[PDB]
């Protein structure tokens, strides 16, 4: 627990919340990490985990993009809403009062070990792209101070949205991309289940995963790849299934 706080947000497509938290002088982490917040302003005793979507390079905030899918999250949503609603209104004297909350972390993912990878599929559906934000993020920063202190040769990215307005979550972060990766670290997959205005031609329907996974075996074998996977748990069973058929790595994280 660090007594902290929402000093800024961002309402986003889908009714997600940006949230940028205050960070404590001594709280480290990695891309791939989550914490537990607590909203005293919503309920005093419930802790919900939200992947921490910045990198730790980004020094004096933490980011949490957070979807309004239930009791919790929509009440989160409606405080930040009618907070900021009233700034425009009022919002003159003070500057923005800034929401209260305890955080509790960082705690791991396996999705961390991307950076001591030779080749990674990352594979997310909606807002199960926040981890992956943080660590592409990390590769960026990691590869302008030091691009031969890292192992990671390739980055196979795969991101499906029910809804197109999703993709603006980060489509900055994908433009930034697209325009540093000269050396070609990174292929970019965007499917709706260019058109994001991007230099990647947003792709329709469900991928073919059986194709993707028998392309990206002839291109790197007899090499190691890893898979890693935020999304429903359907995919899941079809992910394992084509993972032990090319000799892919695996983390059942998904139940
Ligand atoms: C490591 C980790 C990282 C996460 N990172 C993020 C992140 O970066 N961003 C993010 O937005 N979320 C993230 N989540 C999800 C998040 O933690 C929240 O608890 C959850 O997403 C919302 O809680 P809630 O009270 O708002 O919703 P709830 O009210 O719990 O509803 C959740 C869902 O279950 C359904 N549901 C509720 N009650 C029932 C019932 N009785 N029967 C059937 N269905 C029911 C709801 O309709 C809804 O679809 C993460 C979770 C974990 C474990
Ligand atoms: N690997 C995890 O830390 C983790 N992973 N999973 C599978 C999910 O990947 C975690 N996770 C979710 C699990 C259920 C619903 C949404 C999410 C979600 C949204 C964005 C980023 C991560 C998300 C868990 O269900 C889980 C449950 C309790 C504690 C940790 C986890």
């Given at each position: 627990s660090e007594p902290t706080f929402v000093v800024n947000a961002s309402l986003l497509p889908s009714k997600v919340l940006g949230l940028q938290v205050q960070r404590p002088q001594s709280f480290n982490y990695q891309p791939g990490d989550y914490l537990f917040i607590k909203c005293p302003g919503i309920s005093k005793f419930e802790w919900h985990p939200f992947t921490?979507?910045?990198?730790?390079?980004?020094?004096?905030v933490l980011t949490l993009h957070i979807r309004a899918v239930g009791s919790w999250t929509g009440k989160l949503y409606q405080l930040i809403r009618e907070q900021r609603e009233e700034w425009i209104r009022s919002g003159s004297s003070q500057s923005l009062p800034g929401v209260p909350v305890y955080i509790d972390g960082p705690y791991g993912t396996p999705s961390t070990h991307i950076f001591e990878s030779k080749y990674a599929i990352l594979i997310c559906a909606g807002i199960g792209v926040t981890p992956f934000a943080s660590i592409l993020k990390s590769i960026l920063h990691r590869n302008q101070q030091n691009?031969?202190?890292?192992?990671?040769?390739k980055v196979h990215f795969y991101w499906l949205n029910?809804?197109?307005?999703?993709?603006?979550?980060?489509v900055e972060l994908l433009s930034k991309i697209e325009a540093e990766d000269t050396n070609n670290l990174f292929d970019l997959n965007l499917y709706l289940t260019?058109?994001?205005?991007?230099?990647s031609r947003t792709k329709t329907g469900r991928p073919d995963w059986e194709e993707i996974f028998k392309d990206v075996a002839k291109q790197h074998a007899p090499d190691n790849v890893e898979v890693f996977f935020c999304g429903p748990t359907g995919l899941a069973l079809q992910l394992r299934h084509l993972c032990t058929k090319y000799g892919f790595g695996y983390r059942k994280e998904n139940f």
């Amino acid at each position: 627990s660090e007594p902290t706080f929402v000093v800024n947000a961002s309402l986003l497509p889908s009714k997600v919340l940006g949230l940028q938290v205050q960070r404590p002088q001594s709280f480290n982490y990695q891309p791939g990490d989550y914490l537990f917040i607590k909203c005293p302003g919503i309920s005093k005793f419930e802790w919900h985990p939200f992947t921490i979507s910045s990198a730790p390079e980004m020094p004096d905030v933490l980011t949490l993009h957070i979807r309004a899918v239930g009791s919790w999250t929509g009440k989160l949503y409606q405080l930040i809403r009618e907070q900021r609603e009233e700034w425009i209104r009022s919002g003159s004297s003070q500057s923005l009062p800034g929401v209260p909350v305890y955080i509790d972390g960082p705690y791991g993912t396996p999705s961390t070990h991307i950076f001591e990878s030779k080749y990674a599929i990352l594979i997310c559906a909606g807002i199960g792209v926040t981890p992956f934000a943080s660590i592409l993020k990390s590769i960026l920063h990691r590869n302008q101070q030091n691009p031969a202190k890292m192992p990671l040769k390739k980055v196979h990215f795969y991101w499906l949205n029910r809804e197109q307005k999703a993709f603006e979550w980060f489509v900055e972060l994908l433009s930034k991309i697209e325009a540093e990766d000269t050396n070609n670290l990174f292929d970019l997959n965007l499917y709706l289940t260019l058109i994001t205005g991007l230099k990647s031609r947003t792709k329709t329907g469900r991928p073919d995963w059986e194709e993707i996974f028998k392309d990206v075996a002839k291109q790197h074998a007899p090499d190691n790849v890893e898979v890693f996977f935020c999304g429903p748990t359907g995919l899941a069973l079809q992910l394992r299934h084509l993972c032990t058929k090319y000799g892919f790595g695996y983390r059942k994280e998904n139940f």
